[PDB]
Every structure is written in C-alpha cells, then in structure tokens.
PDB file of C-alpha atoms and ligand atoms in Angstrom:
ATOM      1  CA  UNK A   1     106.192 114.238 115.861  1.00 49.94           C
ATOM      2  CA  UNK A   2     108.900 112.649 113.442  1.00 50.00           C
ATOM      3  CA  UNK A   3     111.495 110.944 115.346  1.00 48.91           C
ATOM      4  CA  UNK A   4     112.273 108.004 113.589  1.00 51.39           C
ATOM      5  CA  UNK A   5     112.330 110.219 110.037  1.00 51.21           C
ATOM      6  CA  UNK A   6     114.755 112.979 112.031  1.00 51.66           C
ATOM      7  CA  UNK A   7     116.854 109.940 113.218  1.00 51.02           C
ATOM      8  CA  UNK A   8     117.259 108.479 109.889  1.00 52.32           C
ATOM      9  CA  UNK A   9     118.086 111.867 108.734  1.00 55.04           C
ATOM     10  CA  UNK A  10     120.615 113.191 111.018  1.00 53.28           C
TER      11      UNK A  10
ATOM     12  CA  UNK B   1     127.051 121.411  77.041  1.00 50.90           C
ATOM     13  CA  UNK B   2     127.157 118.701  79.945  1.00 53.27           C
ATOM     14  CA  UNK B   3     129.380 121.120  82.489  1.00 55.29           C
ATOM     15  CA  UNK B   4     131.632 119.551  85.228  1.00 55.74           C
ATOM     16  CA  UNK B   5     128.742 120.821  88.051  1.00 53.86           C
ATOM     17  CA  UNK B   6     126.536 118.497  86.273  1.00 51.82           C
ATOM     18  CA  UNK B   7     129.065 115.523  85.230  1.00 52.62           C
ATOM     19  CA  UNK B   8     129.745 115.585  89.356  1.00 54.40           C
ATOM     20  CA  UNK B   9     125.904 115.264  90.311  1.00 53.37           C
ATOM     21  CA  UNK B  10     125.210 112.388  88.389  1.00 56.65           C
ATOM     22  CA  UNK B  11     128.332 110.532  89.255  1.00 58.09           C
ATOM     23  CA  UNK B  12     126.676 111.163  93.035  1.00 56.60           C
ATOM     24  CA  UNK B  13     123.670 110.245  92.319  1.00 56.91           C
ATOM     25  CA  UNK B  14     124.898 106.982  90.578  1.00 59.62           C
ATOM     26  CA  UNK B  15     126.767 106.223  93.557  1.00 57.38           C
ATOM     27  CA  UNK B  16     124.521 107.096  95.791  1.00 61.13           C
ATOM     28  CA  UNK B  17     121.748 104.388  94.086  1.00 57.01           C
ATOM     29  CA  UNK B  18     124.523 101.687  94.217  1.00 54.00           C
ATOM     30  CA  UNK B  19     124.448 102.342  98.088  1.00 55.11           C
ATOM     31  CA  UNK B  20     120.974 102.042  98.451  1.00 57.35           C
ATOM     32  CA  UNK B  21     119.792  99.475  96.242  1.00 55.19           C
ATOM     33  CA  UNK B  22     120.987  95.858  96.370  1.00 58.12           C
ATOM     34  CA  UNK B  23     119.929  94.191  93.193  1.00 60.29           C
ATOM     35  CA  UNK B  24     120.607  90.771  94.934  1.00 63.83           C
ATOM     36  CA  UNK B  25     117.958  91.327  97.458  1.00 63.19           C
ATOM     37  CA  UNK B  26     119.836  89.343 100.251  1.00 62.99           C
ATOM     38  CA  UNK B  27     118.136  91.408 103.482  1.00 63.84           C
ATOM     39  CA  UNK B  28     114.563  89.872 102.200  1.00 62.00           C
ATOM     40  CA  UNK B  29     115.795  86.797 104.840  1.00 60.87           C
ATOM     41  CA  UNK B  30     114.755  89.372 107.470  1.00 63.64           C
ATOM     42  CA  UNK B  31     111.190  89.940 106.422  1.00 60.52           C
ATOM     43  CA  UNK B  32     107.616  88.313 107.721  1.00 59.39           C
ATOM     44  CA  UNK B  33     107.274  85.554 105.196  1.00 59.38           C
ATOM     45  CA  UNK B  34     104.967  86.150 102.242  1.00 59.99           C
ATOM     46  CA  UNK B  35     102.006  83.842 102.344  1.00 61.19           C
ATOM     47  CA  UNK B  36      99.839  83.752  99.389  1.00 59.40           C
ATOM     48  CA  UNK B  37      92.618  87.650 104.983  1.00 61.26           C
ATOM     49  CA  UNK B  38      95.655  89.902 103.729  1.00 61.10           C
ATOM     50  CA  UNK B  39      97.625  87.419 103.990  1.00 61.16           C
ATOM     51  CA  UNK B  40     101.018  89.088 102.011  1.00 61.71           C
ATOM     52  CA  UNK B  41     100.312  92.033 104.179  1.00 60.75           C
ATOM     53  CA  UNK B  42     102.885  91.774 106.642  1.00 58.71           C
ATOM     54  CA  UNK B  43     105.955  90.609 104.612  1.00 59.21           C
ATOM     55  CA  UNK B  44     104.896  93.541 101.728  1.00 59.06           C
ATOM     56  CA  UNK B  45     104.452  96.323 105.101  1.00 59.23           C
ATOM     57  CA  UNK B  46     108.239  94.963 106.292  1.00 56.72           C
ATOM     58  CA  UNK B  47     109.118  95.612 102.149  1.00 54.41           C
ATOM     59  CA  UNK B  48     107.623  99.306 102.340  1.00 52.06           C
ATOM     60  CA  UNK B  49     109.411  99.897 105.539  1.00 53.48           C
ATOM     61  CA  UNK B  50     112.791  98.574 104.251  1.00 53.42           C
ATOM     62  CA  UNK B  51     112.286 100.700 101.022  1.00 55.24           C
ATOM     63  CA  UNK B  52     111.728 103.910 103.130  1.00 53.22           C
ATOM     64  CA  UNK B  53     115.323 103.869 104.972  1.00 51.95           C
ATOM     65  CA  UNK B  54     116.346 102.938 101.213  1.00 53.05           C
ATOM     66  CA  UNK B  55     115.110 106.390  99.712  1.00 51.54           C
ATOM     67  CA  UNK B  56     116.115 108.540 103.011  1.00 49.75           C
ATOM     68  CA  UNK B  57     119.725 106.953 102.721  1.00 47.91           C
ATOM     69  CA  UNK B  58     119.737 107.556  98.725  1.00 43.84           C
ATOM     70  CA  UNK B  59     117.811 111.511  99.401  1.00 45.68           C
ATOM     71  CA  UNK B  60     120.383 112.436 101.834  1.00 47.81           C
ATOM     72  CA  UNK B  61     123.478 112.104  99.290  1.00 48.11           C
ATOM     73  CA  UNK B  62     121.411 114.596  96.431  1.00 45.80           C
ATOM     74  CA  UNK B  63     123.143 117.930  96.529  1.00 44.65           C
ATOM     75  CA  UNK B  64     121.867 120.405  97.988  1.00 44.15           C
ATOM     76  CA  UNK B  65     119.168 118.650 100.257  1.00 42.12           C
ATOM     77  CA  UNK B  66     120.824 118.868 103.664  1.00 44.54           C
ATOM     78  CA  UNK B  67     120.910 122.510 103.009  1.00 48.19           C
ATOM     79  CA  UNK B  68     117.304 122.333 103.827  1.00 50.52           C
ATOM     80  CA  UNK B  69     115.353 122.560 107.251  1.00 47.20           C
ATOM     81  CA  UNK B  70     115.053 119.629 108.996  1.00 46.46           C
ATOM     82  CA  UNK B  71     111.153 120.354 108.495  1.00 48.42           C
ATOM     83  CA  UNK B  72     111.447 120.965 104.945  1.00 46.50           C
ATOM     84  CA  UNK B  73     113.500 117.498 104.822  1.00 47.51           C
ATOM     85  CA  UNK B  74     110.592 115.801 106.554  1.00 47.59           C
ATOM     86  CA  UNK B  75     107.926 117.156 104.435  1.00 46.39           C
ATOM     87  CA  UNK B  76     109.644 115.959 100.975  1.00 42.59           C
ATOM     88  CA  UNK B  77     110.013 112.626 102.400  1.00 40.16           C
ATOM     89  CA  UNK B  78     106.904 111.972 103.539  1.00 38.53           C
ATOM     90  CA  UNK B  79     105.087 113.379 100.616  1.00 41.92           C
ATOM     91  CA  UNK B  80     107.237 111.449  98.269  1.00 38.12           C
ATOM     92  CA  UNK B  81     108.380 108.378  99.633  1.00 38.27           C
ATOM     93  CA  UNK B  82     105.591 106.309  97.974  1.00 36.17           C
ATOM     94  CA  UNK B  83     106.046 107.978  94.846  1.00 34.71           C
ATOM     95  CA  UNK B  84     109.953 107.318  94.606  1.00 35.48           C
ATOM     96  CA  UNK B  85     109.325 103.471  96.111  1.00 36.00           C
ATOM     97  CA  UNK B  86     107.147 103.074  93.185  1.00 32.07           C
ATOM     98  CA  UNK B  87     109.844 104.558  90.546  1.00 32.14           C
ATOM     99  CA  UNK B  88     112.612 102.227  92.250  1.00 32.54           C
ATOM    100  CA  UNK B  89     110.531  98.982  92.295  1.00 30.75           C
ATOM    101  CA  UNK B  90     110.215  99.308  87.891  1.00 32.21           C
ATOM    102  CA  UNK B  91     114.444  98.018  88.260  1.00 31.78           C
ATOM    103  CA  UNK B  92     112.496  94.783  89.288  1.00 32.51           C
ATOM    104  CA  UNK B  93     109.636  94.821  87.441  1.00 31.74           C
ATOM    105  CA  UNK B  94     109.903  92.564  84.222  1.00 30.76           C
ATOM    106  CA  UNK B  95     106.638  92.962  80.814  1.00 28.17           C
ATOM    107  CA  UNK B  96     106.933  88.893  80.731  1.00 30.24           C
ATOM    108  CA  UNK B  97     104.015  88.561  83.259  1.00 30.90           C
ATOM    109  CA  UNK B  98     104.012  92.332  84.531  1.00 30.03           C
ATOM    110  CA  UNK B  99     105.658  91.220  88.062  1.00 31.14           C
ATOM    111  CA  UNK B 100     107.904  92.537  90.223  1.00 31.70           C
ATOM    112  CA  UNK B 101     110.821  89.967  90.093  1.00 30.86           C
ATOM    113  CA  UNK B 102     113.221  90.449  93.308  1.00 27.60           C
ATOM    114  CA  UNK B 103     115.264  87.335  92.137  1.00 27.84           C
ATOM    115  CA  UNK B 104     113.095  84.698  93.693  1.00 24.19           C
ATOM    116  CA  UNK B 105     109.921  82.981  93.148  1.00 23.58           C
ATOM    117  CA  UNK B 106     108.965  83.522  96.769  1.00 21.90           C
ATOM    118  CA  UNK B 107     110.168  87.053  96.368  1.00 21.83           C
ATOM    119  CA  UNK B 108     108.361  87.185  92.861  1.00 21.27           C
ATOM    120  CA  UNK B 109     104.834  89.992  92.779  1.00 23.98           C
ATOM    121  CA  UNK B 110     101.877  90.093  90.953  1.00 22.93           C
ATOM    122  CA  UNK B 111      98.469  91.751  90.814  1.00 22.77           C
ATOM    123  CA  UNK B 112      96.999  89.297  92.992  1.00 23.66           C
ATOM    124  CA  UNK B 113      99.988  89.375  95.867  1.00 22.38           C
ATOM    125  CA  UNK B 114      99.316  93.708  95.938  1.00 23.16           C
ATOM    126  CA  UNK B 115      95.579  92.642  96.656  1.00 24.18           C
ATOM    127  CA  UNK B 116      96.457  90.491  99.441  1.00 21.89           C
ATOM    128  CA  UNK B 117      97.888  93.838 100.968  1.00 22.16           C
ATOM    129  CA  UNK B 118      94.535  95.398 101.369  1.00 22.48           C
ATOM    130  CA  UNK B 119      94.730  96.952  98.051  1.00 22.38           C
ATOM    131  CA  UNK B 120      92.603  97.574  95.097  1.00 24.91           C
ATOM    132  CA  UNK B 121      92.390  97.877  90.929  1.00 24.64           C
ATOM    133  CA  UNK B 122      91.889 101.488  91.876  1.00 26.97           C
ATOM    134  CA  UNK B 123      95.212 101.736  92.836  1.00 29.28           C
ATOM    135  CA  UNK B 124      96.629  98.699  91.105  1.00 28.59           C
ATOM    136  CA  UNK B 125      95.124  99.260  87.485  1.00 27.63           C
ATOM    137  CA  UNK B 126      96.718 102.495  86.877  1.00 26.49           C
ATOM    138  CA  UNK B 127     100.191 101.301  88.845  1.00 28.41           C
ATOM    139  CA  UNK B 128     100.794  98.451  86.280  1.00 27.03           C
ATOM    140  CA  UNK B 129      99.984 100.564  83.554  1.00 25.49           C
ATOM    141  CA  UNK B 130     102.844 103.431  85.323  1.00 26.44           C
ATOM    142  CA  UNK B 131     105.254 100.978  85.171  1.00 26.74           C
ATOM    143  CA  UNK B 132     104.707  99.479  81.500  1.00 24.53           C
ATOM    144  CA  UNK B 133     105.065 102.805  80.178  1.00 21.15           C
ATOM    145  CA  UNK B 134     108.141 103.571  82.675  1.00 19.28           C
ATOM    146  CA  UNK B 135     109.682 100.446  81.597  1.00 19.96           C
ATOM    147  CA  UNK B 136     109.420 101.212  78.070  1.00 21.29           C
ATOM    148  CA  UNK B 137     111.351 104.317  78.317  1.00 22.44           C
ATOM    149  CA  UNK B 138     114.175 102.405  78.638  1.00 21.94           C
ATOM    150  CA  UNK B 139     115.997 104.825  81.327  1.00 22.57           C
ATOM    151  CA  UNK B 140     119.809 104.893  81.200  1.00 21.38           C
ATOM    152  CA  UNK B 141     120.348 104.371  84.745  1.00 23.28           C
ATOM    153  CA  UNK B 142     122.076 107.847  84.980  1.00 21.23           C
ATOM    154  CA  UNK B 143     118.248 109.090  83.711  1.00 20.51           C
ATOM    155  CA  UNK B 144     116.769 106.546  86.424  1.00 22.72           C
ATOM    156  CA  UNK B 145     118.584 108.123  89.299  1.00 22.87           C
ATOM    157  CA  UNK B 146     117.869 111.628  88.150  1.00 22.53           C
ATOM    158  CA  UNK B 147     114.164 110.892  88.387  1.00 19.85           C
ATOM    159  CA  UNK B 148     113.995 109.682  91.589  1.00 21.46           C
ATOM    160  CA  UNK B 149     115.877 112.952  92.979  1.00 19.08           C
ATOM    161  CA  UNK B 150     113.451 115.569  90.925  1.00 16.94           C
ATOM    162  CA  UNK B 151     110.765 113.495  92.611  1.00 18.71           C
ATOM    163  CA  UNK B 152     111.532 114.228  96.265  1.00 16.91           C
ATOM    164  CA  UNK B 153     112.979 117.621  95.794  1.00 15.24           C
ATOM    165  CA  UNK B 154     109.688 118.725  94.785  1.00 16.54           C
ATOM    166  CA  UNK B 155     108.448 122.251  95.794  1.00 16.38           C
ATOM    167  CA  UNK B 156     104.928 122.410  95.389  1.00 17.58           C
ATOM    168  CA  UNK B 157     104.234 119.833  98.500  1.00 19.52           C
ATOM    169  CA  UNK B 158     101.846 120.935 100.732  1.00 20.05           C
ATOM    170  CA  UNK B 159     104.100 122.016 103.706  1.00 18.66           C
ATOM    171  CA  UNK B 160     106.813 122.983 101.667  1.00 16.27           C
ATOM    172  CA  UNK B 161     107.921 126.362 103.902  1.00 15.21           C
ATOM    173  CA  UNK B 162     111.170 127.506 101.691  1.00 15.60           C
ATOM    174  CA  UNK B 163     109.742 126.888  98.320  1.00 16.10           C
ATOM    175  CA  UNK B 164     111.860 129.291  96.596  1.00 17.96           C
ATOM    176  CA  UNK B 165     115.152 127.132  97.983  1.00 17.37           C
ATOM    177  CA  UNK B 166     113.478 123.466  96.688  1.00 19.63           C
ATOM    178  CA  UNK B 167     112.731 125.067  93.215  1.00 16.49           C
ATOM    179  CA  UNK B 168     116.521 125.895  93.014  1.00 14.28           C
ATOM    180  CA  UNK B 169     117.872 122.546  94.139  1.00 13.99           C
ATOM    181  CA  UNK B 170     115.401 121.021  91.635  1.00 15.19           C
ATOM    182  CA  UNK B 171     116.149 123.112  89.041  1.00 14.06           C
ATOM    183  CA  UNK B 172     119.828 122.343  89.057  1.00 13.18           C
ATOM    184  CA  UNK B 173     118.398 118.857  89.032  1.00 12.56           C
ATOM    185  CA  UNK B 174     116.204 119.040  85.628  1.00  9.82           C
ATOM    186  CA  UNK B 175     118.683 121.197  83.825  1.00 14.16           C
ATOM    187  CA  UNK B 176     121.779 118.065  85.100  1.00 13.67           C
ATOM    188  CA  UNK B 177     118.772 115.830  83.346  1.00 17.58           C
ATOM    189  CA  UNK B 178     117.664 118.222  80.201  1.00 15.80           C
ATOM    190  CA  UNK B 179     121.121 118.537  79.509  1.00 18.57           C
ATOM    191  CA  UNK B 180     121.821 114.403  79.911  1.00 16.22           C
ATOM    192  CA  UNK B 181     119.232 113.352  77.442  1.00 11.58           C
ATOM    193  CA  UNK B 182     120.605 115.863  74.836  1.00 13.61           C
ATOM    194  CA  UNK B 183     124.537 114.777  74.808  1.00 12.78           C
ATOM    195  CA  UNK B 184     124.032 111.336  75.744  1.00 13.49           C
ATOM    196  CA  UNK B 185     120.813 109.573  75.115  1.00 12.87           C
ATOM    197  CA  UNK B 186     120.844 108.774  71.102  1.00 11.45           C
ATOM    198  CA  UNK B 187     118.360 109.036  68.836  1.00  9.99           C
ATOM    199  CA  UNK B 188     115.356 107.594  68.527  1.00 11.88           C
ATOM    200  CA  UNK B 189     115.497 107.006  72.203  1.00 14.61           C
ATOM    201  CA  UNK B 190     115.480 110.565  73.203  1.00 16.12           C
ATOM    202  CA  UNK B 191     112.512 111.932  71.420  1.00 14.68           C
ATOM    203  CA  UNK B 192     110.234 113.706  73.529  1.00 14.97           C
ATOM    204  CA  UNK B 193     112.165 111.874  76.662  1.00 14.43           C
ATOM    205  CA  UNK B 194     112.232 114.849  79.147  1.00 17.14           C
ATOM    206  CA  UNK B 195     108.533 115.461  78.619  1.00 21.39           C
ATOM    207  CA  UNK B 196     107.932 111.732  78.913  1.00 18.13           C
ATOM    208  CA  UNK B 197     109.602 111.173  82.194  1.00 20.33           C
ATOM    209  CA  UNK B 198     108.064 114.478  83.292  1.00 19.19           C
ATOM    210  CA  UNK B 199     105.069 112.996  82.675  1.00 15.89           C
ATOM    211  CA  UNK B 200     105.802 110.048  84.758  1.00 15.71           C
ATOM    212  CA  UNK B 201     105.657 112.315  87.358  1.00 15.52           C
ATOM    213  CA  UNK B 202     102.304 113.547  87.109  1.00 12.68           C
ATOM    214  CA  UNK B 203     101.157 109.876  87.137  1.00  8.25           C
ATOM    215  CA  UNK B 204     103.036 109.447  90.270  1.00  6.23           C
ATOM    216  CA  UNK B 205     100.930 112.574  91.809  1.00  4.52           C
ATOM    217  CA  UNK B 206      97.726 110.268  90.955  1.00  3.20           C
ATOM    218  CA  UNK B 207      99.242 107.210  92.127  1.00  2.91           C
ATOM    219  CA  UNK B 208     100.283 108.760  95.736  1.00  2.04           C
ATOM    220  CA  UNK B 209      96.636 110.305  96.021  1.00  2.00           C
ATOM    221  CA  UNK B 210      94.953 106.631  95.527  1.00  2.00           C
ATOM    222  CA  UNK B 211      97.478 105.179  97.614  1.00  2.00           C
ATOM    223  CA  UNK B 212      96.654 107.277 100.945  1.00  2.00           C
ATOM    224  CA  UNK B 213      92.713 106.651  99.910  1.00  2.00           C
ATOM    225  CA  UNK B 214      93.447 103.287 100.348  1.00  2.00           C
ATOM    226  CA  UNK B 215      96.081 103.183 103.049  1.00  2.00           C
ATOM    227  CA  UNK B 216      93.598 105.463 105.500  1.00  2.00           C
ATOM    228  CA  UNK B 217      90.706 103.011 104.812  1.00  2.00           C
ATOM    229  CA  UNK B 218      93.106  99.641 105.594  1.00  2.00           C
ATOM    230  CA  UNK B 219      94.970 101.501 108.237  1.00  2.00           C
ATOM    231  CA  UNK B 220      92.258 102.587 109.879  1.00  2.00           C
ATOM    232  CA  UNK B 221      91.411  99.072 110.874  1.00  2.00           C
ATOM    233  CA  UNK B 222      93.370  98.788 114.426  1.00  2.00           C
ATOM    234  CA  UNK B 223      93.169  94.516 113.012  1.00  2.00           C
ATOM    235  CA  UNK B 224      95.507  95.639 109.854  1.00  2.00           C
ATOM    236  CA  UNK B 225      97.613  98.366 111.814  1.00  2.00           C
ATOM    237  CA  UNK B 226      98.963  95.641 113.792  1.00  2.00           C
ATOM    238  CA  UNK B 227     100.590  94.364 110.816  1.00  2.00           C
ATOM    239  CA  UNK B 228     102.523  97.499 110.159  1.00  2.00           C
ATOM    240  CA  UNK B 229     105.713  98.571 110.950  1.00  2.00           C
ATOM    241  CA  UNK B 230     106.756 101.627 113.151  1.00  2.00           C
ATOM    242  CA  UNK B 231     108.424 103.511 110.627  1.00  2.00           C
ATOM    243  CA  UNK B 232     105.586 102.720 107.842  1.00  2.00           C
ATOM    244  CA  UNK B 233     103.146 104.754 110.610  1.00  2.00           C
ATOM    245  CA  UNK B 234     105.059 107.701 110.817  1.00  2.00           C
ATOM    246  CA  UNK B 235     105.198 108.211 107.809  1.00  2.00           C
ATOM    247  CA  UNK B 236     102.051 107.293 105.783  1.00  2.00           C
ATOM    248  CA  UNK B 237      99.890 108.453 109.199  1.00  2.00           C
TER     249      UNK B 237
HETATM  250  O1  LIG C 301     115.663  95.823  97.025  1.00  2.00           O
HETATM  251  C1  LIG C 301     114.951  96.754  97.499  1.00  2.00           C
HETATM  252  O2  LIG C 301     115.508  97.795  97.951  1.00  2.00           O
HETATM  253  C2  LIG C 301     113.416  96.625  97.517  1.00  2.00           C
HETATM  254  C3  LIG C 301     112.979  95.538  96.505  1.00  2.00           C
HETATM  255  C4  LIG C 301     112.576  96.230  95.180  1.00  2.00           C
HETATM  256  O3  LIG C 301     112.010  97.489  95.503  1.00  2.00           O
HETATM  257  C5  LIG C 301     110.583  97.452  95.539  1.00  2.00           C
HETATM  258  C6  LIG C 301     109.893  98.506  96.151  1.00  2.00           C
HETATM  259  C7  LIG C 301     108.490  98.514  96.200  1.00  2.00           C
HETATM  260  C8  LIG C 301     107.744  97.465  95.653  1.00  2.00           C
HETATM  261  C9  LIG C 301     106.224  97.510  95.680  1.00  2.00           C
HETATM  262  B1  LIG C 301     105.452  97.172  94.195  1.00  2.00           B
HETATM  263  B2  LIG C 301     103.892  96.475  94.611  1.00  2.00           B
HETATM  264  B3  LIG C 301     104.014  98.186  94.158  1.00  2.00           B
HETATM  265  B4  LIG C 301     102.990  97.696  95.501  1.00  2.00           B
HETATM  266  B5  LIG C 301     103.794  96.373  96.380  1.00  2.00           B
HETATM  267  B6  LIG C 301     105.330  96.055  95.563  1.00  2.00           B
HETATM  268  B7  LIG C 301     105.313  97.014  97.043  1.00  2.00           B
HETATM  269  B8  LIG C 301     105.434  98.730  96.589  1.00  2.00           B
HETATM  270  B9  LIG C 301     105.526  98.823  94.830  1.00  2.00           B
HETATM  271  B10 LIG C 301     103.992  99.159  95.641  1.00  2.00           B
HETATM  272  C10 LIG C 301     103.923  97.998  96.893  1.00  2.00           C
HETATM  273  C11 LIG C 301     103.184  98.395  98.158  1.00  2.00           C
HETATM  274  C12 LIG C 301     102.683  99.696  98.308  1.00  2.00           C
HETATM  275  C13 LIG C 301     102.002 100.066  99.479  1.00  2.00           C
HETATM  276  C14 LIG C 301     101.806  99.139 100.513  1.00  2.00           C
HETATM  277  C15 LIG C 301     101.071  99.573 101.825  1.00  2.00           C
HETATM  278  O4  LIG C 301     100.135 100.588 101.594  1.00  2.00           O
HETATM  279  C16 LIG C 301     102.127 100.183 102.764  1.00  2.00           C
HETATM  280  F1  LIG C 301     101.595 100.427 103.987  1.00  2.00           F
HETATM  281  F2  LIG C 301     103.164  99.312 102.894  1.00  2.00           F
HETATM  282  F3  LIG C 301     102.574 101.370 102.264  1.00  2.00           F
HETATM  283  C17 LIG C 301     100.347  98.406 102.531  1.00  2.00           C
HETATM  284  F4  LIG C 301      99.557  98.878 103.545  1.00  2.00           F
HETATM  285  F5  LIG C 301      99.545  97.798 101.621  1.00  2.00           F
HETATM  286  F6  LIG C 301     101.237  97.500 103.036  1.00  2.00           F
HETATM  287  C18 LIG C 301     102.324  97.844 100.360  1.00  2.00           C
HETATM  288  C19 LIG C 301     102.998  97.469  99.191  1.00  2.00           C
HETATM  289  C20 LIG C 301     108.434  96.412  95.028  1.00  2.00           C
HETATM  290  C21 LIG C 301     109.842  96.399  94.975  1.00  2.00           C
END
C-alpha cells in the first residue's frame, strides 16, 4: 500500500 | 570518552545531511509558483513533497536502519517525516522576522504564507514558538544531524513491530549525542543541552498530532487534494 515509500527506499 | 564507533556515525551523518540538503535551494525552479483561496498551497505541497525524498535519502545512510524490515522502515517514515521536515526547515529559519528564508524573497515564509496552505494558529502558534526555542539552542551542526536521526528511529510509533531492535539503533544514537555534547560542546552552551533537545522532541510529538488534525480536515476536501502531490498522499493519508 506503500509503493512510492518502498521505491524510494530500496 | 567520544569512541571511534561514535566519531564514525557522526562523520556519516554529517555527510549524509550535506547530500540531502542544498543550502542554495536551486531545485525550487521546479516547483508550482508561490502566489501570495490557498493560494501558496500548491508550491508549499511540491516543498513538502521535495522535503520527503530529502529525509528518506538522509534516513537511509543512519546506521543501522536498513537492518530493519521494510515495514518497520515504512512506519518510522511516515510517522516522522513531518516531524524531521520541521527540525530541517529551522537551518532556514532566521528570529529577524521569524521566516523561513530559502535565499529568496519569492522563496522567503511567513505566518501568513503557512495560512495560505490551509493551515491554522493551532498549528502555526506553537510551530514558531518550536523553532525560536530550537534556534536558540544554537545546534553544532554535528548536534543538528543527530537530532534528526533520534527522531525517525523512534520506537514507540504506533506500528513499530521490532521495538526492541529501534530502541537499540536509537540508543547507539543518544549515547553518539550524550557523549558529543560532553567532549565537544563548551560551556555555557551545553547546560542542560541533551534534556533541551530531548525536549524538542516532545514538542515535535504535539506538532505532528495538530498537523494530521489539520491535514485530514484540508485533505479531505477532494478541491484541496487536487493540489497535492502523489508522494505527499501516501504518506500523510
Ligand atoms: O532545501 C530544502 O531541502 C527544503 C527547503 C528548506 O526546508 C524546509 C522544509 C519545510 C518547510 C516548512 B515550514 B512552514 B513549516 B510549514 B511550511 B514551511 B513548510 B513545512 B515547515 B512546515 C510547512 C508545511 C507543512 C505542512 C504542509 C501540508 O500539510 C502538507 F500537505 F504539505 F504536508 C499542506 F497541506 F499544508 F501543504 C505544508 C507546508 C520549510 C523549509
């Protein structure tokens, strides 16, 4: 429900 | 004693600020322009959103957080990224006329500019007041990074699922900091300075609660949702 924070995180 | 673990974390840290925060504010040419009916709304929304991917950039590089769950990562982010945007706008922030001064006149904010966000003296009362008494502590910037990283690797979030593994990152953190003010921060600069910045905290626990008051009454105007960005709606909801 978090992609954009996951992608950023990666 | 300042040990060579701790002499390493803050020369990270330092570095890791430097690569997140450009004091010459050059990528403001990319944001909606500020006109000054919440009118600043959109270029202060594309601010926000350009200060998140700041703080993830600058959270990844503090030790010990990408030893966490990707879940765990997530919920210290979103629980604190208002909180730490707050701490890194005070570098900005100048007593003369209690602004935020991003090197520009056009890029220059007052109390009246936050209200043309959808904002109120609820919020911005107590906010100007947090960074008058931040301001005055007169962080060494070493002190100024340190804060920021206790901040996000907080474990009492709600969410938080490894607590016991947040407290121990954190931990190293405040002893790197406790141990800081004591070799390096003369006196009468240093007096009560841990609990002080500690305290700065708290406020910021306050400050976050008003803030998603407010941002669920704005944002739940579809009109005003328009106006945000992507990444600013994952993240405050
Ligand atoms: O350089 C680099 O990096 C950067 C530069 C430098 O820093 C920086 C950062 C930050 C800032 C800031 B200050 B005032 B205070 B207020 B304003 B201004 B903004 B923030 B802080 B807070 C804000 C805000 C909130 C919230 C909102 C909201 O809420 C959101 F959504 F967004 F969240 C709205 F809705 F209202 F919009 C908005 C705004 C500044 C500075």
């Amino acid at each position: 429900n978090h992609p954009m924070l996951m992608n950023l995180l990666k | 004693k300042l040990s060579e673990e701790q002499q390493h974390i803050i020369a990270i840290l330092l570095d890791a600020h430097h690569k997140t925060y450009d004091p010459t504010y050059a990528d403001f040419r990319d944001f909606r322009p500020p006109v000054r009916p919440l009118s600043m709304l959109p270029h202060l929304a594309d601010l926000v959103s350009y200060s998140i991917q700041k703080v993830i950039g600058f959270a990844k590089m503090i030790p010990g957080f990408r030893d966490l769950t990707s879940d765990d990562q997530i919920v210290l982010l979103k629980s604190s990224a208002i909180e730490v945007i707050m701490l890194r706008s005070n570098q900005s922030f100048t007593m003369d006329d209690m602004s935020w001064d991003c090197g520009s006149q056009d890029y220059k904010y007052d109390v009246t500019d936050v209200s043309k966000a959808g904002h109120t003296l609820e919020l911005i009362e107590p906010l100007i007041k947090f960074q008058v008494g931040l301001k005055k502590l007169n962080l060494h910037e070493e002190e100024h990074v340190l804060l920021m990283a206790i901040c996000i690797v907080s474990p009492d979030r709600p969410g938080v699922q490894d607590a016991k593994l947040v407290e121990a990152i954190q931990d190293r953190l405040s002893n790197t900091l406790q141990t800081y003010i004591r070799c390096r921060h003369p006196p009468p600069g240093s007096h009560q300075l841990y609990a002080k910045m500690i305290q700065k905290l708290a406020d910021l626990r306050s400050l976050n609660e008003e803030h998603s008051k407010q941002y669920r009454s704005l944002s739940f105007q579809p009109e005003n949702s328009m106006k945000l960005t992507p990444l600013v709606l994952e993240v405050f909801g």
